[PDB]
Amino acid sequence: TFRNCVAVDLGASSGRVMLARYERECRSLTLREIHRFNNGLHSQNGYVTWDVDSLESAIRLGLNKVCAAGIAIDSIGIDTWGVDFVLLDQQGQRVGLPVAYRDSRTNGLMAQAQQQLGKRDIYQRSGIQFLPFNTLYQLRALTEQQPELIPHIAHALLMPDYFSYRLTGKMNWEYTNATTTQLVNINSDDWDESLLAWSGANKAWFGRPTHPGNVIGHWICPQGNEIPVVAVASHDTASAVIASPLNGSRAAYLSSGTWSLMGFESQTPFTNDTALAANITNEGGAEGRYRVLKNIMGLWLLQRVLQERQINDLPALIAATQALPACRFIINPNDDRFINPDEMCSEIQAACREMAQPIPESDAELARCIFDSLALLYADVLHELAQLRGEDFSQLHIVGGGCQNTLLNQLCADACGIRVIAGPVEASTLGNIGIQLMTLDELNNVDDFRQVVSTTANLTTFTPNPDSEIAHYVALIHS
């Protein structure tokens, strides 16, 4: 009567297969890691790609571990990073490469769309922020640059539905992730004909987007009992938001991993000129609650520094970085130059030098620059979001692997001047589990699931410190 649900959560820098054990009567929810694996960009034939075959093998390995253990799997669900897709021919073989959102193939195409279609027009139709690697632009790149591939394409599946298909033999187009494409009309929740026309994609490559909770198909443990594969809020950030223990309308979220996604939830989208000017997104959420948010380049910058400087003790780095004075190096992390530079440290240093700032050079200085520059951007965006909705926030919920960074947690609470509640760490995994339980009739809605998370997970309070260095710095920039 306890349910065993397996969540697959694939992020840009890691993948995980996790097993939840849940039972309603007890309000007890546990999560065990079954298989954790690396994920990352691969340079393949002049492209930045995903190794989807290794990802599938990793997923199967995790699933088969649970099976060989003799556990009764009640359901499986898959969430991944947004925007990206896999093209398939009529027989289900991949067409072309699985190109990553960090690929430069899209360069220039967002501007071209704004010029040809109208910036305001794309925004009012999609309600989605302008990011140069949005699916809208990737499909333009594909169809413009690889016209020979086009006749072979029968279907495009977004990443989570791709793996769900590889498990079930059934195709799905999950709503929350479809919204990341900047191809879904915000008023119809279906593909926008005009945006598809510009992208060169064909509507027949897709299906009407379907809200999470449906059973996509079934998977088979090598013995042969049918395990339902459920369509969850398959956009990782959508899952992370479900698991954020939001307490009513004055709570915001910060989903912190490779990206930092900072936002709130709304029953209605914001596509006004205020929203457009701020480049705010209205991503699809479970229950139709829009995730009104902004992308922030996030810990990606630090991931790259760690590789370049060959730093393998992140906790030590954070500890060292706490000793450094704050706010002497400030970059704008959202600057396009940081999406995928060949030389991350060099790019950071150039950006600082261009502003007549001291140059961050030590490992700890580069991390200090990153953490301070994120926190100042956190404060800017949180202000923009409050201004937009016309309602303050009383708490910021930070979730994701980034919520383990106690330094950044405090800088965020200090810069924003808001209480920060950090946790759960694996929020995307938990939200993935939450949706499965709802399909299993074990759980009634998101708000009920948040009560489970809030009484189950480790939640750590960071109280804003008004006399902090960054508080001092921010107070000063106000006037």
Ligand SMILES: [N]C1=N[C]=NC2=C1N=[C]N2[C]1O[C]([C]OP([O])(=O)OP([O])([O])=O[P-](=O)([O-])[O-])[C]([O])[C]1[O]
């Ligand atoms: N220990 C510790 N401390 C602090 N910090 C940290 C740790 N670990 C880790 N970390 C962080 O996190 C991150 C990652 O996160 P996640 O959430 O897992 O991410 P992903 O998912 O992979 O991403 P996306 O994009 O998918 O969201 C790392 O980097 C660090 O920083």
Ligand SMILES: OC[C@@H]1O[C@@](O)(CO)[C@H](O)[C@H]1O
């Ligand atoms: O898809 C690319 C970016 O990756 C995320 O899904 C985080 O993993 C963001 O929400 C999306 O903007």
